[PDB]
């Protein structure tokens, strides 16, 4: 079948800035008849379906806005968008339409580099609801901050905590660019109730010093 | 308008069938060619069937020849895949999408999970605002399989500010995840909050009022 290959994988450009993804086939997509090179372009934004942007290697659909180009010939083809805003932020893929099957580049992440914004910290102290189940969920919550470069460490009584907490990060945000992040301590009824100091102390590029939120149990 | 709408996703048993629609409106359906492709979760677009304007022409991904079958009823204004002997490597997001020049007004898509695991409601608990301008509050859904769940805050009157997680696979093998939201401290002492929970898989709605 027909190989389509994307680079680079990921990406990060400035905002206002220019955006250049290429996309190479393993063969020739041009239908001599029609005169056309049968590619397509699609954006896929956070949690969203694919938008077709471009179709027969350079014509856009219409509502994309002009800052979106297709380019190329042949074996090689280029998406460029220039003047770079924040709802850019996606993976971007290339699509061959010349013969089945109709394969996909592996797609580009586009990251969208905004000036540094320090994360709003936030503690969550696990439910009385959760406790009575026998678990503890202990929350801690990074908001709207950009990098996505973050340290997050838990502290009980002061001893640093290991093995025991996880993280999930969202998507970068189509409006501020920013990320946000938790991360979940999680420990037994008994366990928690031998300690009383429960921290979360956040290190980013943000803020002056690493912050620090806690509660007594 | 023009409307794709792809729904008979569900957790599925490997070897399995499952047959998936893909319901079209606003448009003349049986002039256009229709095609699924599907989406591992955290993964790329991968195509996986065609067919032309009445279905005399079919095609497949390698991955999936042989076991899936791809049809239309023009009448009906939908479009079907038919997946038998389901793996593992089955388990996406399936969309359809109608042609032209390439592949548009791709629909939401359906969630196709492929596993023996058993289905599992979530428990939902609060994250309650401390008295210690913004306030920041949520609600945990812990421990359930398979995906998806869907968060709403106060009915879907409350959007701004609000930030659900990314599900993540715990130690157990259940997924947990917490959305949060920041709302001004000067509302706390009047203004309710209730995360609305749907985990469809296992009928389980939870509305749950997170207070101070």
Not at chain 1, 123 to 138: H, R, Y
Not at chain 2, 28 to 39: A, D, E, G, I, L
Not at chain 2, 84 to 106: I, K
Request: proline fraction near 5%; glycine fraction near 8%.
């Amino acid at each position: 079948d027909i190989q389509l290959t994307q680079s680079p994988d990921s990406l990060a450009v400035s905002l206002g800035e220019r955006a250049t993804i290429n996309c190479k086939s393993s063969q020739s997509i041009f239908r001599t008849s029609r005169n056309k090179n049968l590619l397509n372009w699609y954006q896929q934004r956070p949690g969203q379906p694919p938008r077709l942007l471009i179709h027969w290697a350079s014509t856009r659909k219409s509502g994309v806005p002009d800052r979106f180009s297709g380019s190329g010939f042949g074996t090689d083809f280029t998406l460029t968008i220039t003047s770079l805003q924040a709802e850019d932020v996606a993976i971007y893929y290339c699509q061959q339409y010349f013969s089945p099957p109709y394969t996909f580049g592996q797609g580009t992440k586009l990251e969208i580099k905004r000036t540094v914004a320090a994360p709003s910290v936030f503690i969550f102290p696990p439910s009385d609801e959760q406790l009575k189940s026998g678990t503890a969920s202990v929350v801690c919550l990074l908001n709207n901050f950009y990098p996505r470069e973050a340290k997050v460490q838990w502290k009980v009584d002061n001893a640093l905590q290991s093995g025991n907490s996880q993280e999930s990060v969202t998507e970068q945000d189509s409006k501020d660019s920013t990320y946000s992040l938790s991360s979940t301590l999680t420990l037994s009824k008994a366990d928690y109730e031998k300690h009383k100091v429960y921290a979360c102390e956040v290190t980013h590029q943000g803020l002056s010093s690493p912050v620090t939120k806690s509660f007594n149990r | 308008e023009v409307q794709l709408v792809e729904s008979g996703g569900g957790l599925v048993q490997p070897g399995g069938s499952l047959r998936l629609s893909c319901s079209a409106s606003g448009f003349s359906f049986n002039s256009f060619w229709m095609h699924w492709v599907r989406q591992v979760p955290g993964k790329g677009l991968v195509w996986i069937s065609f067919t032309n304007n009445e279905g005399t022409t079919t095609a497949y991904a390698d991955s999936v020849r042989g076991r899936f079958i791809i049809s239309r009823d023009n009448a009906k204004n939908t479009l079907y895949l038919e997946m038998n002997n389901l793996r593992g490597e089955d388990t996406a997001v399936y969309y359809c999408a109608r042609g032209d020049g390439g592949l548009d007004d791709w629909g939401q898509g359906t969630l196709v999970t492929v596993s023996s695991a058993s289905t599992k409601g979530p428990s939902v608990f609060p994250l309650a605002p401390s008295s210690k301008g913004t306030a920041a509050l949520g609600c945990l859904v812990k421990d359930y399989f398979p995906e998806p769940v869907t968060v709403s805050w106060n009915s879907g009157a409350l959007t701004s500010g609000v930030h659900t997680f990314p599900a993540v696979l715990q130690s157990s093998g259940l997924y947990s995840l917490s959305s949060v939201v920041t709302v001004p401290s000067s509302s706390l002492g009047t203004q309710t909050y209730i995360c609305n929970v749907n985990h469809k898989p296992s009928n389980t709605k939870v509305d749950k009022k997170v207070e101070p």
